[PDB]
Amino acid sequence: KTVVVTTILESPYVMMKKNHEMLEGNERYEGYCVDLAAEIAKHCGFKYKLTIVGDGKYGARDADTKIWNGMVGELVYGKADIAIAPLTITLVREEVIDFSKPFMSLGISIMIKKGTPIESAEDLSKQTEIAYGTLDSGSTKEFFRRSKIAVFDKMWTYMRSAEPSVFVRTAAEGVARVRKSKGKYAYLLESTMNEYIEQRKPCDTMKVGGNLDSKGYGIATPKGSSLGNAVNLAVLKLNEQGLLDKLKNKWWYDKGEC
Amino acid sequence: KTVVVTTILESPYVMMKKNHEMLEGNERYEGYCVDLAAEIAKHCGFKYKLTIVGDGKYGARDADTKIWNGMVGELVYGKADIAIAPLTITLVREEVIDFSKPFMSLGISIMIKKGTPIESAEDLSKQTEIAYGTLDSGSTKEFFRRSKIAVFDKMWTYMRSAEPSVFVRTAAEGVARVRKSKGKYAYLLESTMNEYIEQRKPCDTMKVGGNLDSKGYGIATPKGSSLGNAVNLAVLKLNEQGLLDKLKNKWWYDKGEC
Ligand SMILES: N[C@@H](CCC(=O)O)C(=O)O
Ligand SMILES: N[C@@H](CCC(=O)O)C(=O)O
């Protein structure tokens, strides 16, 4: 059986190549997770098809209907065999799907337009001139929704009722909104993505403050899938061989424009 | 059944309390992993006994006899039910025991006495005046032994044949050897431990350079143990609630003397 890989368009993990219109199948895409999929496939000995998640989302469970969306839902409902993506390992996801040991570490962070008078999450929470938000249907939004920490709770109370809406549908929309809002929008996103964009044209954004948490992305499979074991071993081996570090360098530091 | 916890004496993870001679059972010990054991036990609903690993080691497999020593061996040979320790998740360990998702991130790093003319691993490898080494029977030594990276391979060729021996039996011996050798010994140890000691009296050591790798410590159980699932969920929950971050702060930043 050809392994159906679910993944998500997200720089520098999975990106349409320049001439994608003329390209076929897996060849349409490039990035860290494109390279990683190839290495995992080589180590586990499977053939695979990269497919972009149908709804464009990471994964969240609707509070009323209890249905999972995003790449999580594709795995839960048997629409994909494996997810190879910047997908955050979280408790509520761990309950419904299997995860590899992490292939990359990150924490939630703040992106500002250069020159925005904000140095921390505490600064954000203590003012209203600079709007701030996050991604729909992902781990960063859930973090704020669930936080009992005073500063993060204050931020969520603001965010969930802010008008016009402070939430975005894709990280790319979040980044454009920081860029275009002249310092009146700050975006809460994972350090990995924040640090990537800080090194890309037009070099107009920066990460401020430390990370708000510490977590990891894992390769995900349906609960109890036979692929799980081999893939976990593959990630550990690829880490230990220095390949994950070589890929990080390829897609972040070598992609630097600033 | 009372859960037999194997762990290792290592600051600030597990340490004899000041008045330990007069103290009984679990009360003899304090530290990050002492606190963490208590939280995991509370979430999983078990009673437990902390025991210090009989041989004082993390875990390695003898190349001739193929026997596992350290906390890894206690789990493999059925002498402990769970290991709660700064135990590095590695491929060869993953093959023989179960690991939680990580509870802490780290990478191998260099400790120097203040003022030692060394800024990196490349600096170390390109000279012989300053001896350097690492811990027996742990992941840092294995990293060098297995490295195909030129700089790390050069370091290992030096280390494995250096006289007098550059290896130490405990990290505490490694740290004392840096302190006493007047800048002629540098110690290769995990960033977590290096950063702890940098903030302790007599404030005479420092971490130089970036980390050489990126990995994680996991709670370990015998392969297929029924405890595994609950403990993994507990670690993810404790991370998400901010408790792991609160413990890090308790045992590192609040323990600061420098
Ligand atoms: N990695 C996140 C998506 C990005 C975000 O939430 O900021 C997730 O898996 O949900
Ligand atoms: N955490 C390491 C021990 C310390 C070291 O090797 O530097 C291990 O699990 O083997």
**Residue A50: which CATH number?**
3.40.190.10
- C-alpha–C-alpha distance, residues A212 and A186, integer Å: 15
Query: Largest alpha-carbon pair distance within chain B?
Result: 54
| Interchain CB distance below 8 Å, B232 and A94 | yes
Among the listed residues A166, A220, A174, A214, the one whose alpha carbon sits nearest the alpha carbon of residue A196: A174
Consecutive H or E run containing A6: strand A3-7
* B150 and B32 within one domain: no
Q: At residue A153, what are phi and psi to the nearest 5 degrees?
A: -55, -45
Strands A82-83 and A104-106: unpaired
Q: At residue A155, what are phi and psi to the nearest 5 degrees?
A: -55, -50
- C-alpha–C-alpha distance, residues B135 and B150, integer Å: 21
Number of domains in chain A: 2
CA of B200 to the centre of ligand 1 (A): 37
Among the listed residues B187, B192, B166, B189, the one whose alpha carbon sits nearest the alpha carbon of residue B176: B187
Give one DSSP letter per residue of A102-149, joined into a string: PSEEE-EEEEEETT-S--SHHHHHT-SSSEEEEBTTSHHHHHHHH--S
* A161 and A143 within one domain: yes
* A177 and A97 within one domain: no
* B161 and B64 within one domain: no
Which among A190, A195, A196 is the best mutation to test ligand 1's pocket, defined by most ligand atoms within 8 Å of the CB? A190
Strands of chain B, DSSP E: 3-7, 15-16, 29-30, 48-52, 82-83, 97-99, 104-106, 108-113, 131-134, 185-190, 205-208, 215-217, 220-222
Q: What type of residue is B176? A: A
Centre a 10 Å sphere on the Cβ of residue B233 and count the other Cβ atoms it contains. Answer: 17
Nearest beta carbon to residue A240 from set B91, B233, B245: B91
State the resolution, in angstroms.
Answer: 2.0
Q: How was this entry determined? A: X-ray
Helix count (H) and strand count (E) of chain B?
10, 13
Selected for mutation to probe chain B from A101, A151, A219 (highest B CB count within 10 Å) is A101
* A111 and A179 within one domain: yes
DSSP A232: H
Q: What type of residue is A32? A: Y
| Interchain CB distance below 8 Å, B101 and A105 | no
Tell me whether the omega of the peptide bond preceding residue A12 falls within 30 degrees of 0, making it cis. Answer: yes
* A241 and A171 within one domain: no
* A142 and A94 within one domain: no
CB pairs < 8 Å spanning A and B: 66
- C-alpha–C-alpha distance, residues A83 and B160, integer Å: 42
* B164 and B87 within one domain: no
| Alpha carbon B139 to chain centroid, angstroms | 8
Quickly tell me which residue has 């419904």 as its tokens: A96
Centre a 10 Å sphere on the Cβ of residue B42 and count the other Cβ atoms it contains. Answer: 11
* B226 and B99 within one domain: yes
**Three-state SS at B154:** helix
Contact B134, B144 (CB under 8 A): yes
Q: What type of residue is B61? A: R
Q: At residue B49, what are phi and psi to the nearest 5 degrees?
A: -120, 120
For residue B172, the ligand closest to its alpha carbon is 2
The CB of A189 under 6 Å from ligand 1? The reply is yes
Strands A131-134 and A185-190: parallel
Q: What type of residue is B177? A: R
- C-alpha–C-alpha distance, residues A116 and A179, integer Å: 11
Consecutive H or E run containing A52: strand A48-52
Contact B60, B128 (CB under 8 A): no
- Tell me the chain B residues in contact with residue A149 when contact means C-beta distances shorter than 8 Å: 242
The CB of B58 under 6 Å from ligand 2? The reply is yes
Burial class (CB in 10 A: 0-12, 13-18, 19+), A62: exposed
Contact A104, A10 (CB under 8 A): no
Residue A53: domain span: 1-106+216-255
| Residue B100, both tokens | 């939680």
* B247 and B180 within one domain: no
* A226 and A100 within one domain: yes
* B190 and B126 within one domain: yes
| Interchain CB distance below 8 Å, B242 and A215 | no
Contact B243, B230 (CB under 8 A): no
Strands B48-52 and B3-7: parallel
End residue of a domain, out of B200, B215, B230 = B215
